[PDB]
Automatic annotation (TrEMBL):
The chain holds residues 4 to 209 of 638 of the full protein. It comes from the Viruses. The gene is A064R. The keyword Hydrolase does not apply. It comes from Paramecium bursaria Chlorella virus 1. GO terms for cellular component: membrane. This is UDP-Glucose glycosyltransferase. Keywords: Glycosyltransferase, Metal-binding, Nucleotide-binding, Transferase. The keyword Metal-binding applies.
């Protein structure tokens, strides 16, 4: 399928995010995926609004790449494992069921929520849903942690029974501290919960 990977970060001075951007862009070039990257400074800078911004950036990606079938959001703290950069996304996940609108990933047993949306596949037919997710950013309880992640799991999922899958995260949302043993074989490696300087240091070793 036509896949558009999207992400974003501000400011440009944040080195780890420059590096993850580079690796994602390279990965897209290898497999012919579209790549959308939001470099603008957010107008709403509170923690909740920052987390929700992915559901606004997806519309940017849809406008730029109208032929997209699958949108793939990656946090700026996610990168493509160099060992696996020559392998397409479809070698790791089956996107053939026409009924699915979201592919998401758990973070068990080490995490704190049933899904981790640092990596999130959204079908083109869920763009109007993402518009709703964005609209909920300033309404309780969706404006409370974990924000868009809670909104997807607790607002969206109940309303689309059978049209989402929660997958093991070992290859596609491979949280570094939680699944160190799987990092080597992952496609998407997720530097979740760590500081900027810690991320800079990790990326230097990549
Ligand atoms: Mn993250």
């Amino acid at each position: 399928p036509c896949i558009t990977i999207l992400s974003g970060h501000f400011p440009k001075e944040t080195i780890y995010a420059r590096k993850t951007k580079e690796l994602v862009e390279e990965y897209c070039s290898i497999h012919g995926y579209n790549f959308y990257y939001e470099e603008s400074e957010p107008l709403e800078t509170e923690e909740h609004a920052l987390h929700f911004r992915r559901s606004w950036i997806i519309q940017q990606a849809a406008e730029k790449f109208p032929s997209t079938e699958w949108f793939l959001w990656l946090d700026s703290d996610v990168y493509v494992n160099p060992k696996n950069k020559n392998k397409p996304i479809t070698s790791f996940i089956d996107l053939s069921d026409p009924n699915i609108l979201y592919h998401t990933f758990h973070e068990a047993p080490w995490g704190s929520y049933p899904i981790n949306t640092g990596v999130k596949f959204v079908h083109k037919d869920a763009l109007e849903i993402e518009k709703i997710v964005w609209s909920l950013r300033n309404e309780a309880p969706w404006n409370t942690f974990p924000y868009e992640q809670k909104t997807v799991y607790e607002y969206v999922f109940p309303r689309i029974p059978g049209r989402y899958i929660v997958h093991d995260p070992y290859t596609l949302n491979c949280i570094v501290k939680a699944y160190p043993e799987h990092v080597k074989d992952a496609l998407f490696v997720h530097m979740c919960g760590t500081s900027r300087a810690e991320r800079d240091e990790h990326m230097e070793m990549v």
